[PDB]
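User: Predict the full complex structure for these chains.
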Amino acid sequence: AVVLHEDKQYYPSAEEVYGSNVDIMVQEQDTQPLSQPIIEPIRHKRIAIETTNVPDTVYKKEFLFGLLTGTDDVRSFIVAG
Amino acid sequence: RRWDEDVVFRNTHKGVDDTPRPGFVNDMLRSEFHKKFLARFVD
Amino acid sequence: XXXXXXXXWHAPWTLMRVISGHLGWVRCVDVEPGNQWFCTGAGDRTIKIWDLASGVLKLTLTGHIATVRGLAVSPRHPYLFSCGEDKMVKCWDLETNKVIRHYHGHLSGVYALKLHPTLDVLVTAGRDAVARVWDMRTRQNVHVLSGHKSTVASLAVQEFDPQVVTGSMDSTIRLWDLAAGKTLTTLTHHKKTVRALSLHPDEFTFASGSSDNIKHWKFPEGAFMGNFEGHNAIVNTLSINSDNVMFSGADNGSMCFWDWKSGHKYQELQSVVQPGSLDSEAGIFASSFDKTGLRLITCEADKSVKIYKQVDNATPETHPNLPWTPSNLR
Amino acid sequence: YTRYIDKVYIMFRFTDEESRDLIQRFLNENPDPTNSNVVNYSKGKKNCWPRDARMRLMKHDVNLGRAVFWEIRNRLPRSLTTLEWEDTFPSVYSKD
Amino acid sequence: AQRSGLNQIPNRRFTLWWSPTINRANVYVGFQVQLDLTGIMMHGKIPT
Amino acid sequence: RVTEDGINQFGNRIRQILMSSGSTTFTKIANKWNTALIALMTYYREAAISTPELLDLLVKCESKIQTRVKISLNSKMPSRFPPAVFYSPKELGGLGM
Amino acid sequence: NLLARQFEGRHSTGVAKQITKQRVDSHQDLELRAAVMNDILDMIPEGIRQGKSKTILQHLSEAWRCWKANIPWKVPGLPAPIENMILRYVKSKADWWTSVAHFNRERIRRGATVDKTVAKKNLGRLTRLWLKAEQERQHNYLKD
Amino acid sequence: TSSRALPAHLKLKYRQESQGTEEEVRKQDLREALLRAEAAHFAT
Amino acid sequence: HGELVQASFRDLIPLRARLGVGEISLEKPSDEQKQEVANKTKLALQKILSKQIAQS
Amino acid sequence: GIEFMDMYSHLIPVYSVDPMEKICDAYLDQYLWFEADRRHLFPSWVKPSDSEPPPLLVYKWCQGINNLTDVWETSNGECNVLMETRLSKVFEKVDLTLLNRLMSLLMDTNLASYASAKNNVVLSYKDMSHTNSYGLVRGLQFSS
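Assistant: Here is the predicted structure of the ten-chain assembly.
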C-alpha cells in the first residue's frame, strides 16, 4: 500500500502512452567510438613493392617463354647461406 | 535455524528489483541520473 | 473561373519509433544521401548520429556552445556542416570525424544552413538580418545578401535562378541573384514571420509557410499558386515528398499532412508527447522525409525524435481520407 | 560487531552445514542461471592491493557474501533505512 | 584591491630579509637591469 | 595502508587552502600547510609512509604551496630556489614549513 | 599588421566578438530574449496592439526567478497561450542550468577547474538543486 | 589580418567512387534497401 | 530591376484563375541552362574571390 | 539558515542556528551525555567513544579478530565473512513522531519534547525556504 518516496514514480510508462505497435528506443550511450570514420576513406592496402607494368629488359619476353617451353636450357636452384 | 527465528522483522527487502531505470523521462530534475548525482555529491 | 478552379488520395500515417536520446530541444534534422543515418542538431550543443533503419546511436559530435540550430550534409564531399546561436559555422570532416574549418564573419546567432547543389558553396543566415554566402574551400565570404530588416529565419537553395530563397520576421520573401548579390522579386503576400520554405523535388515550386496561410508558389516571377488552409497554429516545417505529400508540424504538436495538387488536407495528428513532459511541451521545430520519399522523421520539443511510416494495407476502403467539398467565398 | 556513526562492522563465522543452507536458501529465493554474481561483486575497490593479495572469486565464496548481505538487508525495515550493494564489500575468508 | 595589498604588508619584509639569496643569477635566469640611482642589480622584476 | 579516500580527502584539504587565500600572508599559508600535514602524518603515521600513492601527493602538494609563495614574489618562476627560505625555522626569518 | 594600424586605424565597429567563456552566459540569454520576441509577435493575432512584446518578458524572467526559488508562479488573468509560452521557455533554461551544475561538479571532482568563481557558482547551483529536492521529500511525505 | 585567416586546407575532398558518389545513388534502389533493413532490425 | 514587382490585385489571384493564361509549366527547366547558369555564377564568384584575396 | 561547506568531492550542509537557542542546546547536549554515561545507557559496540581515537580502534579490532577461538582453521568447510556497510540515508529516513515516542523513554517527558520540537524548524537560504517535518537535523548541539 505505502509507496516509499524512493519508488513514487510520478509519470506513466513510455509504453502505455503508445504501448503496442510503436518502438520505444532509449539511446544514451554511443556505439562505434569517435575513431571510426563514418564515411570510410578509400585505402589501398599494400604489403610489398610491385611494378604497375613490366619493366623492359634487353631480352624479349617471348624468347623467355621460348626457353621455358621449348628446351632444356632452363635450370632452377636455391641460393642459400 | 534458531538465529533467524529471533529476528523481529522478516523478508522486508523481498521484492526489491526492476524500478523505472529503463523508463526515459523528459524532466532533468526528476530522472534517476539526477537522483544519483545528488545522492553522491552530498552528505 | 476562380470558384471553378478551387473545386479540384494518399494514405494515413502512424507512429513507429520513439528515439528518446537528447537532453534539450532538437532544432534540426538532416538525412544522409545514402539513407542509412541521419543527424539531429539538438540544444545540448551536440550533433548526434542515428540509424534510419535501427534507430540507434553512432556519434556525438560535440563542438558547439549553444543550440546547434542548423545542420547539412553535403553529398558531393564527405563533409557535414553545422550552425548555432554562437555565430559558429563548421565543416566536420566525416572521414576523420573532427572539425576542419570555421567560417567567421557572422555578427550574431545563425539559423539557416544550406548547401548549394552544383558550385562548391555554402549559404547561411541569421539575425544579422542577412544571408551570407560562403566559399567551401577558401573559407571566405563572397556575398552579403543585404536587404531584409530582421531575423532571416529560413533558406532554400536551387540549381537554376531563384537559387537563393530567404524568409524573415519582415513577413516577406526575396528571390536572389547569387552572382550580383541583389534581389530579383520581393514577395510580400505573407502577414507574419516566415518560419519555413522548401522546394518541391521535381515540380519547380516552393511552399512558404508561417502561422498564417501556409502559402504555395511557382517560380522566376514566383507568382502565387494557392493556399493550403486549415492549420491553426504556428508552423515551423514545410517538408515536401516525392509523391506529392506535404507535412506541416506546428508548435502545438498539430501535424497535418496535405496534398500538393488540390489543397485538401487528408490527415491531422496530435504529437502525444513523452512521459515526464508538460502539456505545453509538445512541439515540432523540424522534420523531414528520406531521399526515397517513404519516411517521415521529426524533431519534437519532447526531447525526442519520432518516426512516422505509412500503414501497409492502404486502400480508400480501409483508411478513409477526409471529405472534399465545394462552396462560395474567396 | 561495531557501529561507528553510520558505518556498520560485523564478523561472521559459519560451519559447512550453515554455509550450505544460507547459500542454498538465497539461491532458491533468487535463482542463478546466468552466473553474473561474479561480475559485479567488486567495483574496482581493492585494485590498490596487488593481484596476489586481492580476494579470489570462487563460485562458492561469491555467493556466500552476496547471501549474507541479502540476509541482513532484510532484518532492517525498508522504511527506516536501506542497505546498498555499492556501499558494501564483505570479505570471505575460506579454504581458497 | 587595497585590503589585499594591505594584508600583504608583512609579506614585504620577508623579501628584504632573504633578498641576498633570492636576487641572483642562479635563481632567476633573467635580464639583469641595474636599479636606477644605485649600484645594485635586480635580476627578475620582483617589485616587492 | 591509507584507503583511497584519505588520499583524495587530503589532496583537497590542500586545494581548499589555495582558494581561500587569494591574497594573504606567507607566514599564514605555511601555518595552514603545517597543520594539514601534521594532522595527516599524526593519524596515518605507519600507513602513510607505507603507500606510494600518498607519498606522490605529499611531494606535489608541498610543491604547490611553495609555488604559491614562489609566484607572489615573481612571475617568471625560479629555475631553482634556496631551501633555507622555506624550511629554516621562524626565529631566523623562516616560514617554518 | 601593426603598421597598417598606424596608417589606417581600426575598421568600423563590428567585425565579430567570437564568444569565449566570459561572454557565454550573457549571449545565451540575448538569444532567448529574442526568440520570445519572435514567438509572441507570431502568437499575437493580426490587430491586438504590440504593447505586450516587451511586456511579456518581465514575466518570463520573474518566472525563471520563481523557479530557482521553488515558489510556484500562479499569475492572475493572462492568456493561457502566453502562460505556456513562458512555462516552456523556462523549462528550457532549467535544463541548461541544471546540466551545467552536473558538468562542473565533475570538473571539480576531477581537479581541472579553479578560481572561486566557478567553485562558488557551482556550489550555489547545487545548493538550490538540492533544496528543490528536499522540499519534495517533505511535501511528498505528508501527502504520501 | 590575423592568425586564423592564414592559408589552410587549400584542398577540397570530392567523393571517391566507393564511399558515396552521387551517380552510384541513382543506380542504387534506395527503396528496397530501406525495407530490408527495417525487417532485420525488427526480427532481432 | 523592377519588372517582377507586383502592382494590381491580380497578383493576389491564384495562377489557376489569372484569366489570360495559356498553360501552367511545372517541370524544372533543362540541362543546357543549368550549365549556362553554373558557368555564369562560378565565373562571377571567382572574379570577386580573387579580388578579396588581393585586399586580404 | 542552511549553508553548504564545499570539499570539491562531496558537499555538506551546515546549520546556522540562532545564538540564544545554541546556549540552551549546548547546555542540554552536555547534560544528556554526562547523565547517560553516569548510568551506562550505551553499550560497548556503539563506538566513536571517549576511549579510543580512530586508529587505535583499527588495532583493537584486528587484535579482536585473532582473539576469537580457532579463527584461522579452514580444514573442514569453515567460512569467515567480515562485512562493512553504510546505511544509505538514515538521516533522511528518520521521522519525528516515532523519535518523539522513543525519546520519551530515555528521559523526562518534558525534555524529550524540546528535542522533538527542536527538529521541526524552518530551513532557509536566500530566496527560498521550507519546513523540516520528515528529516532529523544535525546542527543541533545534541544531534549527536
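The longest helix of chain C spans residues 2-5.
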